[PDB]
């Protein structure tokens, strides 16, 4: 068999954006196996060893003015630059969620399921309403699921004691639509 | 927030290298190191942007060289195998005979080497399957996705079969209607 030991090395340049390209932070990090050793935080301005393993690198990299100058300006020439290039098809990408309501194959009380799938971006807000009023207790979510294909999904149940005539509404607010999406369950 | 990540890695002694761009956790693209060209996660991206693939090849070379130096100065401290958390789900609420897709989530593992196989009633499936490359995680472990387009039925029973050095034995995640 293959029992040879493995040795991994990762380099990551993270561009963090808040309020568009208003504030931008660049975090350059090195990881040996599972241990981050060195990093360049644009908020810091220079490399910093994260563990003793990285000390040599931080010291050597910080001794290169040209490296530091280019690195310091990367928040503009790299981050803000790439944001401007891909913004149109990433930050603005939008796919409306497919919403459907049905009772769970679980069950006295009746467990309702609000299936919200195939949407992008991931930020979405789903709430349950009984007769037009928010439901706090009894709600249980599966959590936001990222499908790895630029799509997300989630299921949000609502345990209930159904009374003929009641109207349980599942409400979904998402960037893809101006007005919320509603799907009712008629008791 | 909003995060764009340029992630790369190199693994010895498998000599596996990867170079990809990430946006809020979703892959924008990665570079095919053999064909030396850019492969966009979604076809459409390649029409709205471009990228110099050769440049990833320059970085990868540096990455390896760096790996060799680090390996040596850590006294050949090997990576600890961390087994994957495997989950199987469908892309949307399943309905009999209504085309759907099986997603196999292989998450929180390292090193970035894995053998994934789909099974339909104990037999391996090939047609229509697709998979992603290794995706980065804040904890520096990896995630990965395998897909299997399928036609729901009551008889069929599927398994996402995953092998990883972290696993003493093949892990089979079951999924049926």
């Amino acid at each position: 068999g293959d029992t040879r030991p493995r040795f991994l090395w990762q380099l990551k340049f993270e561009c963090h954006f808040f309020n568009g390209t208003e504030r931008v932070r660049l975090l350059e990090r090195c990881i040996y196996n599972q241990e981050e050793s060195v990093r360049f935080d644009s908020d810091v301005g220079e490399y910093r060893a994260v563990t003793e393993l990285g000390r040599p690198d931080a010291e050597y990299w910080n001794s290169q003015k040209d490296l530091l100058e280019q690195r310091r300006a990367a928040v503009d020439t790299y981050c803000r630059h790439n944001y401007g290039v891909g913004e149109s098809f990433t930050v603005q990408r939008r796919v409306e969620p497919k919403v459907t309501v049905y009772p769970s194959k679980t069950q006295h009380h009746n467990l309702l399921v609000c299936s919200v799938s195939g949407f992008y971006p991931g930020s979405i807000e789903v709430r349950w309403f009984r007769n037009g009023q928010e439901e706090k207790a009894g709600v249980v979510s599966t959590g936001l699921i990222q499908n790895g294909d630029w799509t997300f999904q989630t299921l949000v149940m609502l345990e209930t004691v159904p009374r003929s005539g009641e109207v349980y509404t599942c409400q979904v607010e998402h960037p893809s639509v101006t007005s919320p999406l509603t799907v009712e369950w008629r008791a | 927030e909003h995060v764009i990540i340029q992630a790369e890695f190199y693994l010895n002694p498998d000599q596996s290298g990867e170079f990809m761009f990430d946006f809020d956790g979703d892959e924008i693209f990665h570079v095919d190191m053999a064909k030396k060209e850019t492969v966009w996660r979604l076809e459409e991206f390649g029409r709205f942007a471009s990228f110099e693939a050769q440049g990833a090849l320059a970085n990868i070379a540096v990455d390896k060289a760096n790996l060799e130096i680090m390996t040596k100065r850590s006294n050949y401290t090997p990576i600890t195998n961390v087994p994957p958390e495997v989950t199987v789900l469908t892309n949307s609420p399943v309905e009999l005979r209504e085309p759907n897709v099986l997603i196999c989530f292989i998450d929180k593992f390292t090193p970035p080497v894995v053998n994934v196989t789909w099974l339909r009633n104990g037999k391996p499936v090939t047609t229509g399957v697709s998979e992603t490359v290794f995706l980065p995680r804040e904890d520096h472990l990896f995630r990965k996705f395998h897909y299997l387009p399928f036609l729901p039925s009551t008889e069929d029973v599927y398994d996402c079969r995953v092998e990883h050095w972290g696993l003493d034995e093949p892990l089979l995640k079951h999924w049926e209607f």
Binding site: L11, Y60, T77, Y78, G84, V85 | E8, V62, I69
Partner: peptide, 15 residues
């Protein structure tokens, strides 16, 4: 389309 810029990997100090 528009070009996505790369950041060059930094060589660590030699042995």
């Amino acid at each position: 389309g528009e070009l996505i810029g790369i950041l060059n990997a930094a060589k660590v100090p030699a042995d």
